[PDB]
Design a protein around this ligand. Sequence first.
Ligand SMILES: NC(=O)c1ccc[n+]([C@@H]2O[C@H](COP(=O)([O-])OP(=O)(O)OC[C@H]3O[C@@H](n4cnc5c(N)ncnc54)[C@H](OP(=O)(O)O)[C@@H]3O)[C@@H](O)[C@H]2O)c1
Ligand SMILES: NC(=O)c1ccc[n+]([C@@H]2O[C@H](COP(=O)([O-])OP(=O)(O)OC[C@H]3O[C@@H](n4cnc5c(N)ncnc54)[C@H](OP(=O)(O)O)[C@@H]3O)[C@@H](O)[C@H]2O)c1
Lengths: 323, 334
Amino acid sequence: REVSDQPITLTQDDVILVTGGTGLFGKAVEHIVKKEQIKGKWVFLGSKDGDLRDADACKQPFEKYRPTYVIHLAAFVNFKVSFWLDNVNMNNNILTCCYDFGVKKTISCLSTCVFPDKIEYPITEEKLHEGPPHFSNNAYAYAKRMLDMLGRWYNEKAVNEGKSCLFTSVIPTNLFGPHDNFNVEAGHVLPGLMHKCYKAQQNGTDFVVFGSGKPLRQFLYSHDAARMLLWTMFNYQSEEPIMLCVSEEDEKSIGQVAQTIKDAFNFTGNMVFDTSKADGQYKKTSSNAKFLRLNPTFQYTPFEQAIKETVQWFLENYETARK
Amino acid sequence: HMAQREVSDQPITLTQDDVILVTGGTGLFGKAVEHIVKKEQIKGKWVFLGSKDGDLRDADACKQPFEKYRPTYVIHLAAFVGGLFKNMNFKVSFWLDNVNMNNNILTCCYDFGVKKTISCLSTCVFPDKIEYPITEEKLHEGPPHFSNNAYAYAKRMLDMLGRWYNEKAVNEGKSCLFTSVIPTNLFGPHDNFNVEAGHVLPGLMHKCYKAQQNGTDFVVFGSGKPLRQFLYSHDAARMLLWTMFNYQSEEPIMLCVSEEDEKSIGQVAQTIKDAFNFTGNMVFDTSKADGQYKKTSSNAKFLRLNPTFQYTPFEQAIKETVQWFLENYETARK
Ligand SMILES: NC(=O)c1ccc[n+]([C@@H]2O[C@H](COP(=O)([O-])OP(=O)(O)OC[C@H]3O[C@@H](n4cnc5c(N)ncnc54)[C@H](OP(=O)(O)O)[C@@H]3O)[C@@H](O)[C@H]2O)c1
Ligand SMILES: NC(=O)c1ccc[n+]([C@@H]2O[C@H](COP(=O)([O-])OP(=O)(O)OC[C@H]3O[C@@H](n4cnc5c(N)ncnc54)[C@H](OP(=O)(O)O)[C@@H]3O)[C@@H](O)[C@H]2O)c1
């Protein structure tokens, strides 16, 4: 079945290798692991630790740390050629090292933006390969598609050779939280609005939002994503990707996001919407039905509570935050 | 982009200064190109690579012929289609061996400034849920069949990588064109005639040869009634060469025969029977289950772009292959 009869129980002898562990998602995983006293030696790799696109450099952390579990979060996010080569080489290397070094379970990370361009909503995991992705990021998208397929192919090989190697994947939708990229120009909508509001509070200016503020998105707190990913590691046995998102009823509009940010900074000035900028797509809804059916009692952090925590982290660490 | 037609106004004319690199030039398709190049005395220095020249899955080894020969054109036919041994045939290998070889070759093509590169797809990589006849535009409209999906996806990503390298060439102002052909079932000399691992038609030839030498019956699996399109490798080589000379579009172009020219599996078996002059019985082992009746691919694009193209009649192409097989059996791939 999709979930093991009993959860995997980590011990002090287990080693968990987390590629791309220094970003938004990795830092949340590290935060939950320490907070919940999850056992094992957790190794959070960054680029400083080695170029995973090179096959030889990629095995060095496997030879060094001898992992029993792998959480594969690294990606390259410039010519489309480079996005294809860099990502497909890294993914091919990591999964191959995971099989060769006898990793018990490997969990990789897909993305909402790799699904078919022509797709009927809500996006469900089963639609991943049902048509070409959008043209605009199709190199990144196809490399993610082939990360999923390579996992299924290594499962076939493991079954054939009697090896105990499991490959699966998760699909987070719009993460936000501490250790995000808060650049107003380059960063994601939610972290950038936090920085714009704070500058409006420090200065005398108005909080300006690009667009009408009406498009609705599903936003997942990074700490929640980490709890969902860890549950997946402990319990989820299927090779099918599992979507990690909030329900549709929990989708906030951009204006709601901006308003929540203002009231978390205790911002008193005016907040205006610049409708010169064209509005993005109105809704791009992902279904959390699978996670809801397999882990029905999961509790999310309410959006307002999550914004207060990120603003609070962002305020306490502004000097050291990525901007 | 609206500017260029699918074909150049005049075909490219090769000179003695041109170097044409053919990866996979020792296999079925490659040897056919080598035969046409020699028969029609095409200009240029032609290099037909094989695995003995270097393992194109390795990035460093792949550079060695490009640094050595500095080609102006590349015909990329090399592919990993199966190993002789089981341990080399997991789906994992079909993905890795092919995607590594394809990434290396197209990257070398770009870095060394090849003017035009033609790679090779296959009609068995198209989506499983599809309406017949198959047209080139349907290549990515859904997942391929499960049984060969690693090979199929590697071919799809060879097509995509070419489109992405065209985008880079346009942006960098380089004059590099990447396109591809999609041949149907090929047959001919220098094929793989192993009955277990080879294609149906060359296997039927080797089977008929064994039946004649041994005294046995010529046994064909299935009823014989499935319809297939079969393209003589020498004809495919001429279509491929026309493509290099004339075709400017990055969209793949199918190389196949018309629907009228589809032969039944029994019809192929009979033609093979009558070309060996085999006088024993031809038997259909209906205990084996045969594939789907029709799997038609469209040749509309090539027929529209090259209407005067002349095919070799099926019977004459079979007799030429059988005669090659009898004269060269000792050195033939089996
Ligand atoms: N955030 C979202 O909303 C979202 C949506 C869909 C999917 N995802 C997926 O979730 C995963 C990461 O989430 P994130 O948002 O936390 O990413 P992130 O914040 O950008 O951090 C990414 C990590 O990847 C590592 N990395 C990148 N290229 C590398 C390379 N060539 N060799 C070695 N390490 C490399 C970085 O190490 P340095 O710190 O040294 O660069 C960093 O630790 C990715 O697979 C991403 O596609 C996220
Ligand atoms: N034959 C068909 O029915 C058919 C139908 C559709 C598409 N195609 C396409 O046509 C192209 C060639 O087909 P084929 O029928 O000619 O295949 P083939 O007869 O099996 O020959 C394949 C070629 O690839 C070369 N090769 C394989 N692995 C290599 C490596 N690692 N490094 C260097 N060279 C390597 C072989 O070299 P050695 O000779 O040294 O092993 C041979 O030259 C392939 O891309 C295939 O998909 C064929």
